[PDB]
Assembly symmetry: C4
Homo-oligomer: 30 residues x 4
């Protein structure tokens, strides 16, 4: 439930690495 919630938050803190890095891809092409 809470350890569910805290371990989404730690999927979101992945998507927010893969956010930063595939922005930093485009920022490459430009």
């Amino acid at each position: 439930x809470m350890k569910x919630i805290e371990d989404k938050l730690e999927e979101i803190x992945s998507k927010x690495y893969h956010x930063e890095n595939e922005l930093a891809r485009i920022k490459x092409l430009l």
Copy 2:
């Protein structure tokens, strides 16, 4: 409340697909 919170987290884990894919649109145009 908690099943509210855990099912936002699963809206955020949509916006973080539509994040990855409409980055991967731009990364198309370039």
Copy 3:
């Protein structure tokens, strides 16, 4: 605390509009 958490989640579901729309700006310029 929980109504704190559920109303960040509803700041994140703003930043994830302003995510979608300022991607959809760049996707404008291209």
Copy 4:
């Protein structure tokens, strides 16, 4: 646990500044 969760939410409300600003980098190059 909850003060864990509320202080990820406040890592996510960083990554969602560094989101807005490194979009607003690309939106610079274009």
